[PDB]
Amino acid sequence: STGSATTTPIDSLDDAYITPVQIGTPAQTLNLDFDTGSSDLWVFSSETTASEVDGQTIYTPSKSTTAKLLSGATWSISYGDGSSSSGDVYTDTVSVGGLTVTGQAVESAKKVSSSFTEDSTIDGLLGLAFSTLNTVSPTQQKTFFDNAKASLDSPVFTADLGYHAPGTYNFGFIDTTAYTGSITYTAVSTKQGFWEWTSTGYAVGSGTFKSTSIDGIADTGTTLLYLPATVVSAYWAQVSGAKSSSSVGGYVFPCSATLPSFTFGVGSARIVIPGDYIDFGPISTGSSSCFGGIQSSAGIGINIFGDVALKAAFVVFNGATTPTLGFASK
Numbered sequence: 001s002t003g004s005a006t007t008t009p010i011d012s013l014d015d016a017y018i019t020p021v022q023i024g025t026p027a028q029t030l031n032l033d034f035d036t037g038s039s040d041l042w043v044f045s046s047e048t049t050a051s052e053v054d055g056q057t058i059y060t061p062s063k064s065t066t067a068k069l070l071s072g073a074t075w076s077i078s079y080g081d082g083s084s085s086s087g088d089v090y091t092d093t094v095s096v097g098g099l100t101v102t103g104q105a106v107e108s109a110k111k112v113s114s115s116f117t118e119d120s121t122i123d124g125l126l127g128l129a130f131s132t133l134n135t136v137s138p139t140q141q142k143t144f145f146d147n148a149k150a151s152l153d154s155p156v157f158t159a160d161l162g163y164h165a166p167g168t169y170n171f172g173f174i175d176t177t178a179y180t181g182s183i184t185y186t187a188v189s190t191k192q193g194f195w196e197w198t199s200t201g202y203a204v205g206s207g208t209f210k211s212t213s214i215d216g217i218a219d220t221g222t223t224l225l226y227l228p229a230t231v232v233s234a235y236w237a238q239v240s241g242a243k244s245s246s247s248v249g250g251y252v253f254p255c256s257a258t259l260p261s262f263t264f265g266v267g268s269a270r271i272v273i274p275g276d277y278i279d280f281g282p283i284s285t286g287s288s289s290c291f292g293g294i295q296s297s298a299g300i301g302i303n304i305f306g307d308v309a310l311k312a313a314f315v316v317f318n319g320a321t322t323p324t325l326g327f328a329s330k
C-alpha cells in the first residue's frame with residue numbers, strides 16, 4: 001500500500017503545517033501537525049477540558065463504531081518549546097491520504113497547554129519519530145508509520161514541505177517527479193529516538209563551504225533551524241544590523257534587509273536554503289525588527305533541522321531495518 005496527503009502551512013509565516021487525517025468510523029477528519037520529532041498521535045477530543053478548546057476540531061470516540069478505550073492507558077508529553085498535553089488512549093482506524101491503519105493508538109487529550117489552545121488551526125499531532133519515544137503508559141504504543149510499515153510498498157515516508165505553499169507527505173513510495181537531481185542518503189542514529197544525522201558543513205550566501213560535522217535531528221514539528229552558536233553568528237554577521245536580542249529571544253534583523261542564503265551539507269551534496277526562507281517577519285505587529293529563521297541551539301542541547309531547512313529539500317525518512325535519511329534539491 002501507499003498514501004499521499006497534502007500538507008498546508010497554518011499561517012503566512014509557515015509556522016507549522018497541517019495534514020488532514022481521518023479517524024474513526026464514520027471518519028472524523030482532523031488537521032494534524034506531522035512531527036518527525038515526536039512519537040505520539042494525540043488529538044483534541046470530546047474529553048478535552050472545555051476551557052482549553054478554542055476553535056479546534058475535536059475527536060469524539062463515542063461517535064466512532066471502531067473506537068475502543070485502551071484500558072488503563074494514559075499519556076503525557078512535553079515538547080522542547082515548553083508546551084504539553086496529556087490524557088487517555090483509544091485505539092481506532094486512522095487513515096492518511098488513502099493509507100489505513102486499524103488498531104492505531106489515538107491519544108485523547110484531557111489537558112493541553114495554552115499554546116495549543118491558542119492555535120485554532122492544529123487539532124493535534126501525529127508523531128513520526130521512533131516508537132521508543134512514545135509516552136503511553138504502562139504499554140508503549142507504536143506510531144502510525146511503524147504500524148503501517150509492513151504493509152507499505154517500501155518502508156519509507158517522504159516530506160516535501162512548501163515555502164508559503166502546500167506540500168506533500170507520501171507513505172510507501174518515492175515520487176521521482178518531486179525532486180531534481182539525485183537523493184543523497186546519510187546515516188541515522190536512533191539512540192535518542194530521533195531521526196538524528198550528521199551534516200557535513202555549511203556556507204553563508206556565496207561564501208566558501210566550511211567542512212565540519214554538525215549532528216542534529218530532522219524535525220518537521222520544529223519551525224526554525226537551530227544550529228551551534230558559532231554557525232549562527234557567522235550567518236547573522238552577514239546581515240547589516242542583525243543582533244541577538246535577549247529580550248526577544250534570538251537573532252533579529254532589520255525588516256529592510258535582504259537575507260543571504262544558507263547552505264548545509266548532506267554527504268558531498270548541498271542543500272541551499274534561500275534567504276527569504278529565513279525571514280519570520282516583524283517581532284510584533286508593525287515593528288521594523290524581524291525575527292530570524294536561523295537561531296542558536298545552545299540553550300536546547302541538540303541541533304534541529306526544522307522546517308526552515310527541511311522545506312528546502314525533498315526528504316526521505318527511510319524506515320528500513322537500518323534507517324537512513326535522504327535529501328534532494330527540488
Ligand SMILES: O=C(Cc1ccccc1)Nn1cnc2ccccc21
Nearest residue numbers: 035037038079080081083221222300
Ligand atoms: O519542541 C521542539 C523544539 C524546540 C523549538 C523551539 C525552541 C526549543 C525547542 N519542536 N517540536 C517538535 N514537536 C513539537 C510539537 C510542539 C511544539 C514544539 C515541537
